């Protein structure tokens, strides 16, 4: 089998994501001194979407949108999967038609390695540290809930990166195993084995590699990656950042005390992404494979007095989004397309030649043409979400345009607050100008209402015209 | 922020210690009529190590071993810190890699409240009563000598419990302040404020609360605690205690005249420990926090004709050692593990998920597995020390097995005395049987020599094989 054989009529897919990875934390973007040589290289061979976002910047909700192509109400994943939200059915539906189900039906070899976080835990909880106490977070994904991912080396959620746990394809619920290796390292090694096994190109394949770092347990990263930032000037990083509290404050110190390890995690993740790319090139599986590097959400880490994410601020919504496909896409410096994490379902499927297979239930944007050609879509506006899992009449709904971030809050069906930021004049979003721009607010109000009605979201009824 | 958020991958730590607290002075142990309802409750929710000891039962030396994880010669704290030992460098090294430095590096919020006693005083001495006269004992701990403890409300040493003094985090050397409240009361109040501030769980935390009572100034305890023992039958306490001198003697009367107030102090300390535990439970910070209650050493108080400690007798070496961590440790009635005060550095760090961070310089036992599982270590033998600060060739070196206490004394490098007690047949250690057990003494001799050689202790050369 040394002779070159027929190229598959549809491309492979290697979907790589790292949890809690901020969009501006990429070296080639030139905004932060974080080292990501492998992602920079990947970007140079493809496209770097510098305005990409995640509409509901929370783990399960974001992943739920990605898999179903539906906004939160429809995906049913309105909050993180854990025992607190379980009674409300917060988990991916076994009946949901996900993009992985589609590719499996189209004859693709399927694999998933890493964090899934789309199953509701139930008693008795599996024996991992994050299941002890009042609230459990980790649960097994039985075969019938894997949506086509036949090769399985994954877990629900678990954050001790230095000794991660996984369930292989045939392991029963209580037979997960621990690995004495950094998560991204092990995951990249298993991804390489999977990729090596696809070298004969007898059929197409789709592989997801879902890494945990740079998600918390920021310090849980190998020392060699920390050494790279031992001389990092943290105070210099806060220069011109009014959104980062001053030194001496709770949140200002939180940012300063964790930024070094956050970058260490990213650089470590970067190196392992490099290993996967190298495996693809070694097996001649890079040119006709769509490789995507993205994240479910960013992180505030003290900025805006917020420690986590789950908020409309840029540091929370902005995510990396690098895509390569040498055979069909010429490299483009930077693309301003406001593609969202959840748009990947219809976008990738259409790019892959399966546009007719996208379910009528999919609500997100099919930006395949924009991605392939680079043709802009200036009218593209993405939504923002926060849904109280036990009371949908409470929460946030908003819109993000290329210039403004607008959001309204409601409590029991009544609008409670209005927020508007002009990111051009106020890039760090420090001035809520909603009360100063009544005309503009009214315009966004009808626009939001129309959006909520289009997506069959009951919240639409709270906006009184 | 009402929704439950991700559990930290490593636990918090609340290390509580009361100076000069005897191991058997715990109510649930059933040997003495002292009331400790809060510690009894803590024990019931965790583990009570009834054979725990302190190898060098003296304040600074013991604390020095705890912080560095090294035996006395290596820790450099060979005697109490005061102006007499200062010329010999008896103090914690600023360059010593302590467990607190490790946790700080791992992103933990750090706090220390109470007695430190690890700094050598220097002229002009700070203005406290114990610094007047020929020998000064109290000194300030500048920020660079705090080994990572950012939140600081502490002092060197000071024993007038009714009006204690402290230095807050930013106070200069001569700006300490006095408080008109019982030490343990104030300390518990400050610990509660610290704990309340950790409720958002944005990062892990480690807090040390080092209380002075039941250390001398035995009478310096609130009247309400003394009232509890107003009817205590002191003579009954001496029943079956041949180690306690008879009434009418100097040491026999000393024991009888101070036992009531000693218990009063303990009960008072107990109540304040209860306040701290309650704060942890109120903030949902008890289940995933390792809580430790221990002491640097016990006290003879007249027993064996000794007023103080700094000796191999059980009443001096035995210390309380209660540990709880609901999320990972099921309660165990009593554990016979002979864990030592100084073993907490490697033991806690490994239990917390930072085994790889223990310096190669650490010499004490890592008993994390034993503590977590309850798996015994029958071969565990702990050392005993007494080092003459101005002449290391003089002093004691010994071993404590589950049955025997063996010790040898040397003067200028020559063995001066041999002591051996069979605690099974002679629990109150009244019969030195060394001269009657030559075979056994020879066995312990080689065992001691091997121990001293392993720990790079020059005293090893004095034992002539």
mmCIF file of N, CA, C and O in Angstrom, chain A residues 20 82 84 115 129-130 132-133 135 137 157 159-160 162 215-217 219-220 223 226 250-251 254 257 261 307 309-310 386-389, chain B residues 2-10 104-109 197-198 200 202-204 287-288 326-329 352-357:
data_model
loop_
_atom_site.group_PDB
_atom_site.id
_atom_site.type_symbol
_atom_site.label_atom_id
_atom_site.label_comp_id
_atom_site.label_asym_id
_atom_site.label_seq_id
_atom_site.Cartn_x
_atom_site.Cartn_y
_atom_site.Cartn_z
ATOM 1 N N UNK A 20 -11.522 27.175 29.321
ATOM 2 C CA UNK A 20 -11.199 28.448 29.959
ATOM 3 C C UNK A 20 -10.000 29.181 29.358
ATOM 4 O O UNK A 20 -9.225 29.816 30.080
ATOM 5 N N UNK A 82 -24.254 19.225 37.284
ATOM 6 C CA UNK A 82 -23.843 18.870 38.635
ATOM 7 C C UNK A 82 -25.116 18.425 39.344
ATOM 8 O O UNK A 82 -26.210 18.539 38.786
ATOM 9 N N UNK A 84 -26.775 19.778 41.637
ATOM 10 C CA UNK A 84 -27.694 20.868 41.958
ATOM 11 C C UNK A 84 -28.661 21.121 40.800
ATOM 12 O O UNK A 84 -29.835 21.420 41.012
ATOM 13 N N UNK A 115 -12.476 16.136 28.455
ATOM 14 C CA UNK A 115 -13.634 16.600 29.211
ATOM 15 C C UNK A 115 -14.902 16.690 28.367
ATOM 16 O O UNK A 115 -14.908 17.305 27.302
ATOM 17 N N UNK A 129 -12.872 13.045 43.743
ATOM 18 C CA UNK A 129 -12.899 14.119 44.737
ATOM 19 C C UNK A 129 -14.005 15.162 44.596
ATOM 20 O O UNK A 129 -14.545 15.630 45.603
ATOM 21 N N UNK A 130 -14.342 15.536 43.363
ATOM 22 C CA UNK A 130 -15.369 16.548 43.144
ATOM 23 C C UNK A 130 -16.803 16.042 43.262
ATOM 24 O O UNK A 130 -17.746 16.723 42.861
ATOM 25 N N UNK A 132 -17.569 14.491 46.325
ATOM 26 C CA UNK A 132 -17.677 14.390 47.776
ATOM 27 C C UNK A 132 -18.275 15.702 48.274
ATOM 28 O O UNK A 132 -17.944 16.776 47.768
ATOM 29 N N UNK A 133 -19.154 15.618 49.263
ATOM 30 C CA UNK A 133 -19.757 16.824 49.793
ATOM 31 C C UNK A 133 -21.199 17.028 49.372
ATOM 32 O O UNK A 133 -21.877 16.093 48.951
ATOM 33 N N UNK A 135 -22.430 18.917 46.793
ATOM 34 C CA UNK A 135 -22.675 18.908 45.353
ATOM 35 C C UNK A 135 -21.658 18.099 44.545
ATOM 36 O O UNK A 135 -20.448 18.311 44.665
ATOM 37 N N UNK A 137 -20.148 16.784 40.790
ATOM 38 C CA UNK A 137 -19.968 17.342 39.452
ATOM 39 C C UNK A 137 -19.590 16.369 38.342
ATOM 40 O O UNK A 137 -19.799 16.656 37.164
ATOM 41 N N UNK A 157 -16.119 15.923 34.493
ATOM 42 C CA UNK A 157 -15.285 17.072 34.821
ATOM 43 C C UNK A 157 -14.431 16.650 36.011
ATOM 44 O O UNK A 157 -14.859 15.841 36.835
ATOM 45 N N UNK A 159 -10.635 18.463 37.921
ATOM 46 C CA UNK A 159 -9.606 19.478 37.741
ATOM 47 C C UNK A 159 -8.220 19.325 38.346
ATOM 48 O O UNK A 159 -7.454 20.290 38.361
ATOM 49 N N UNK A 160 -7.888 18.137 38.846
ATOM 50 C CA UNK A 160 -6.551 17.918 39.390
ATOM 51 C C UNK A 160 -5.748 17.402 38.189
ATOM 52 O O UNK A 160 -5.597 16.197 37.993
ATOM 53 N N UNK A 162 -2.656 17.072 37.394
ATOM 54 C CA UNK A 162 -1.469 16.238 37.578
ATOM 55 C C UNK A 162 -1.759 14.743 37.710
ATOM 56 O O UNK A 162 -0.853 13.920 37.585
ATOM 57 N N UNK A 215 -7.929 25.735 32.563
ATOM 58 C CA UNK A 215 -8.989 25.846 33.563
ATOM 59 C C UNK A 215 -8.314 25.669 34.924
ATOM 60 O O UNK A 215 -7.233 25.085 35.008
ATOM 61 N N UNK A 216 -8.953 26.156 35.985
ATOM 62 C CA UNK A 216 -8.361 26.097 37.313
ATOM 63 C C UNK A 216 -7.665 24.856 37.749
ATOM 64 O O UNK A 216 -7.986 23.730 37.353
ATOM 65 N N UNK A 217 -6.755 25.128 38.671
ATOM 66 C CA UNK A 217 -5.844 24.158 39.193
ATOM 67 C C UNK A 217 -4.762 24.779 38.339
ATOM 68 O O UNK A 217 -4.028 24.086 37.648
ATOM 69 N N UNK A 219 -2.084 26.131 39.138
ATOM 70 C CA UNK A 219 -0.747 25.740 39.571
ATOM 71 C C UNK A 219 -0.405 24.303 39.208
ATOM 72 O O UNK A 219 0.752 23.886 39.299
ATOM 73 N N UNK A 220 -1.417 23.545 38.795
ATOM 74 C CA UNK A 220 -1.224 22.143 38.453
ATOM 75 C C UNK A 220 -0.764 21.982 37.003
ATOM 76 O O UNK A 220 -1.501 21.495 36.134
ATOM 77 N N UNK A 223 6.528 21.937 36.037
ATOM 78 C CA UNK A 223 7.483 22.986 36.364
ATOM 79 C C UNK A 223 8.188 23.621 35.176
ATOM 80 O O UNK A 223 8.475 24.819 35.202
ATOM 81 N N UNK A 226 6.299 26.515 33.999
ATOM 82 C CA UNK A 226 6.303 27.623 34.947
ATOM 83 C C UNK A 226 7.614 28.401 34.836
ATOM 84 O O UNK A 226 7.629 29.628 34.938
ATOM 85 N N UNK A 250 -8.516 42.559 46.823
ATOM 86 C CA UNK A 250 -8.771 41.131 46.698
ATOM 87 C C UNK A 250 -8.655 40.632 45.262
ATOM 88 O O UNK A 250 -7.934 39.672 44.984
ATOM 89 N N UNK A 251 -9.360 41.291 44.352
ATOM 90 C CA UNK A 251 -9.355 40.885 42.952
ATOM 91 C C UNK A 251 -8.108 41.307 42.183
ATOM 92 O O UNK A 251 -7.716 40.644 41.225
ATOM 93 N N UNK A 254 -5.598 38.763 43.097
ATOM 94 C CA UNK A 254 -5.981 37.485 42.515
ATOM 95 C C UNK A 254 -5.449 37.397 41.083
ATOM 96 O O UNK A 254 -4.912 36.367 40.670
ATOM 97 N N UNK A 257 -1.560 37.177 41.197
ATOM 98 C CA UNK A 257 -1.084 35.933 41.796
ATOM 99 C C UNK A 257 -1.288 34.695 40.922
ATOM 100 O O UNK A 257 -0.696 33.651 41.190
ATOM 101 N N UNK A 261 0.900 31.347 36.205
ATOM 102 C CA UNK A 261 0.548 29.944 36.043
ATOM 103 C C UNK A 261 -0.484 29.752 34.941
ATOM 104 O O UNK A 261 -0.527 28.697 34.311
ATOM 105 N N UNK A 307 -14.057 36.896 39.641
ATOM 106 C CA UNK A 307 -13.046 35.861 39.667
ATOM 107 C C UNK A 307 -13.204 34.847 38.541
ATOM 108 O O UNK A 307 -12.211 34.374 37.978
ATOM 109 N N UNK A 309 -16.013 33.294 35.186
ATOM 110 C CA UNK A 309 -16.596 33.770 33.939
ATOM 111 C C UNK A 309 -18.136 33.826 34.167
ATOM 112 O O UNK A 309 -18.615 34.203 35.246
ATOM 113 N N UNK A 310 -18.898 33.435 33.151
ATOM 114 C CA UNK A 310 -20.355 33.450 33.203
ATOM 115 C C UNK A 310 -20.850 34.908 33.225
ATOM 116 O O UNK A 310 -21.754 35.255 33.985
ATOM 117 N N UNK A 386 -27.477 34.102 30.106
ATOM 118 C CA UNK A 386 -27.329 33.677 31.484
ATOM 119 C C UNK A 386 -28.743 33.251 31.828
ATOM 120 O O UNK A 386 -29.666 34.068 31.808
ATOM 121 N N UNK A 387 -28.913 31.965 32.102
ATOM 122 C CA UNK A 387 -30.222 31.423 32.439
ATOM 123 C C UNK A 387 -30.169 30.818 33.835
ATOM 124 O O UNK A 387 -29.302 29.992 34.123
ATOM 125 N N UNK A 388 -31.079 31.237 34.708
ATOM 126 C CA UNK A 388 -31.114 30.678 36.055
ATOM 127 C C UNK A 388 -31.756 29.311 35.848
ATOM 128 O O UNK A 388 -32.920 29.222 35.463
ATOM 129 N N UNK A 389 -30.993 28.252 36.097
ATOM 130 C CA UNK A 389 -31.480 26.895 35.860
ATOM 131 C C UNK A 389 -32.807 26.513 36.497
ATOM 132 O O UNK A 389 -33.579 25.761 35.899
ATOM 133 N N UNK B 2 -25.079 32.684 43.788
ATOM 134 C CA UNK B 2 -25.806 31.753 44.643
ATOM 135 C C UNK B 2 -25.615 30.308 44.188
ATOM 136 O O UNK B 2 -25.710 29.373 44.987
ATOM 137 N N UNK B 3 -25.348 30.133 42.900
ATOM 138 C CA UNK B 3 -25.146 28.810 42.330
ATOM 139 C C UNK B 3 -23.853 28.169 42.819
ATOM 140 O O UNK B 3 -22.855 28.853 43.064
ATOM 141 N N UNK B 4 -23.878 26.851 42.971
ATOM 142 C CA UNK B 4 -22.704 26.120 43.423
ATOM 143 C C UNK B 4 -21.664 26.157 42.315
ATOM 144 O O UNK B 4 -21.985 25.943 41.149
ATOM 145 N N UNK B 5 -20.420 26.442 42.672
ATOM 146 C CA UNK B 5 -19.376 26.480 41.666
ATOM 147 C C UNK B 5 -18.356 25.382 41.903
ATOM 148 O O UNK B 5 -18.340 24.727 42.947
ATOM 149 N N UNK B 6 -17.503 25.196 40.908
ATOM 150 C CA UNK B 6 -16.472 24.179 40.929
ATOM 151 C C UNK B 6 -15.641 24.115 42.200
ATOM 152 O O UNK B 6 -15.157 25.125 42.707
ATOM 153 N N UNK B 7 -15.492 22.898 42.703
ATOM 154 C CA UNK B 7 -14.717 22.636 43.902
ATOM 155 C C UNK B 7 -13.241 22.757 43.541
ATOM 156 O O UNK B 7 -12.830 22.361 42.449
ATOM 157 N N UNK B 8 -12.442 23.320 44.441
ATOM 158 C CA UNK B 8 -11.015 23.456 44.178
ATOM 159 C C UNK B 8 -10.409 22.054 44.137
ATOM 160 O O UNK B 8 -10.821 21.174 44.893
ATOM 161 N N UNK B 9 -9.426 21.826 43.251
ATOM 162 C CA UNK B 9 -8.786 20.508 43.135
ATOM 163 C C UNK B 9 -7.876 20.099 44.302
ATOM 164 O O UNK B 9 -7.451 18.944 44.389
ATOM 165 N N UNK B 10 -7.575 21.048 45.185
ATOM 166 C CA UNK B 10 -6.756 20.782 46.368
ATOM 167 C C UNK B 10 -7.485 21.412 47.556
ATOM 168 O O UNK B 10 -8.099 22.467 47.427
ATOM 169 N N UNK B 104 2.174 28.906 49.287
ATOM 170 C CA UNK B 104 2.067 30.246 48.729
ATOM 171 C C UNK B 104 2.370 30.161 47.236
ATOM 172 O O UNK B 104 1.697 30.788 46.418
ATOM 173 N N UNK B 105 3.392 29.387 46.883
ATOM 174 C CA UNK B 105 3.759 29.231 45.480
ATOM 175 C C UNK B 105 2.674 28.506 44.691
ATOM 176 O O UNK B 105 2.557 28.687 43.479
ATOM 177 N N UNK B 106 1.879 27.689 45.374
ATOM 178 C CA UNK B 106 0.815 26.966 44.697
ATOM 179 C C UNK B 106 -0.478 27.776 44.609
ATOM 180 O O UNK B 106 -1.535 27.229 44.302
ATOM 181 N N UNK B 107 -0.389 29.075 44.891
ATOM 182 C CA UNK B 107 -1.552 29.944 44.784
ATOM 183 C C UNK B 107 -2.499 30.045 45.967
ATOM 184 O O UNK B 107 -3.609 30.563 45.827
ATOM 185 N N UNK B 108 -2.069 29.567 47.129
ATOM 186 C CA UNK B 108 -2.907 29.614 48.323
ATOM 187 C C UNK B 108 -2.899 30.978 48.992
ATOM 188 O O UNK B 108 -1.889 31.680 48.979
ATOM 189 N N UNK B 109 -4.041 31.344 49.567
ATOM 190 C CA UNK B 109 -4.178 32.592 50.308
ATOM 191 C C UNK B 109 -3.622 32.154 51.665
ATOM 192 O O UNK B 109 -4.101 31.168 52.231
ATOM 193 N N UNK B 197 -13.880 35.732 54.963
ATOM 194 C CA UNK B 197 -13.378 36.298 53.726
ATOM 195 C C UNK B 197 -12.999 35.290 52.655
ATOM 196 O O UNK B 197 -12.684 35.677 51.531
ATOM 197 N N UNK B 198 -13.028 34.003 52.992
ATOM 198 C CA UNK B 198 -12.673 32.953 52.039
ATOM 199 C C UNK B 198 -13.919 32.258 51.491
ATOM 200 O O UNK B 198 -13.819 31.319 50.700
ATOM 201 N N UNK B 200 -16.072 32.896 49.167
ATOM 202 C CA UNK B 200 -16.308 32.818 47.721
ATOM 203 C C UNK B 200 -15.547 31.678 47.045
ATOM 204 O O UNK B 200 -15.805 31.352 45.886
ATOM 205 N N UNK B 202 -12.663 31.416 45.679
ATOM 206 C CA UNK B 202 -12.017 31.709 44.404
ATOM 207 C C UNK B 202 -10.619 31.096 44.346
ATOM 208 O O UNK B 202 -10.060 30.899 43.266
ATOM 209 N N UNK B 203 -10.064 30.794 45.515
ATOM 210 C CA UNK B 203 -8.737 30.194 45.612
ATOM 211 C C UNK B 203 -8.645 29.420 46.921
ATOM 212 O O UNK B 203 -9.441 29.640 47.831
ATOM 213 N N UNK B 204 -7.689 28.484 47.028
ATOM 214 C CA UNK B 204 -7.588 27.744 48.288
ATOM 215 C C UNK B 204 -6.918 28.639 49.332
ATOM 216 O O UNK B 204 -6.340 29.675 48.992
ATOM 217 N N UNK B 287 -16.049 20.805 55.061
ATOM 218 C CA UNK B 287 -15.913 19.525 54.379
ATOM 219 C C UNK B 287 -14.670 19.356 53.521
ATOM 220 O O UNK B 287 -14.087 18.269 53.492
ATOM 221 N N UNK B 288 -14.269 20.396 52.794
ATOM 222 C CA UNK B 288 -13.083 20.250 51.958
ATOM 223 C C UNK B 288 -11.904 21.031 52.487
ATOM 224 O O UNK B 288 -11.166 21.674 51.736
ATOM 225 N N UNK B 326 -13.702 15.740 56.139
ATOM 226 C CA UNK B 326 -14.915 15.013 55.756
ATOM 227 C C UNK B 326 -14.958 14.497 54.321
ATOM 228 O O UNK B 326 -15.327 13.350 54.083
ATOM 229 N N UNK B 327 -14.574 15.337 53.366
ATOM 230 C CA UNK B 327 -14.600 14.937 51.962
ATOM 231 C C UNK B 327 -13.744 13.720 51.620
ATOM 232 O O UNK B 327 -14.064 12.982 50.688
ATOM 233 N N UNK B 328 -12.670 13.492 52.369
ATOM 234 C CA UNK B 328 -11.786 12.373 52.059
ATOM 235 C C UNK B 328 -11.516 11.364 53.163
ATOM 236 O O UNK B 328 -11.025 10.269 52.890
ATOM 237 N N UNK B 329 -11.826 11.721 54.402
ATOM 238 C CA UNK B 329 -11.561 10.818 55.512
ATOM 239 C C UNK B 329 -12.792 10.474 56.335
ATOM 240 O O UNK B 329 -13.450 11.351 56.894
ATOM 241 N N UNK B 352 -2.554 16.972 50.500
ATOM 242 C CA UNK B 352 -3.148 18.080 49.759
ATOM 243 C C UNK B 352 -2.945 18.038 48.251
ATOM 244 O O UNK B 352 -3.515 18.857 47.531
ATOM 245 N N UNK B 353 -2.139 17.088 47.783
ATOM 246 C CA UNK B 353 -1.883 16.964 46.359
ATOM 247 C C UNK B 353 -0.594 17.616 45.891
ATOM 248 O O UNK B 353 -0.406 17.835 44.692
ATOM 249 N N UNK B 354 0.307 17.914 46.824
ATOM 250 C CA UNK B 354 1.568 18.562 46.474
ATOM 251 C C UNK B 354 2.798 17.746 46.872
ATOM 252 O O UNK B 354 3.821 18.301 47.274
ATOM 253 N N UNK B 355 2.700 16.428 46.749
ATOM 254 C CA UNK B 355 3.808 15.546 47.095
ATOM 255 C C UNK B 355 5.091 15.900 46.330
ATOM 256 O O UNK B 355 6.187 15.875 46.895
ATOM 257 N N UNK B 356 4.955 16.245 45.053
ATOM 258 C CA UNK B 356 6.118 16.583 44.231
ATOM 259 C C UNK B 356 6.810 17.875 44.669
ATOM 260 O O UNK B 356 7.952 18.132 44.277
ATOM 261 N N UNK B 357 6.127 18.680 45.481
ATOM 262 C CA UNK B 357 6.684 19.950 45.944
ATOM 263 C C UNK B 357 7.473 19.864 47.249
ATOM 264 O O UNK B 357 8.031 20.864 47.695
#
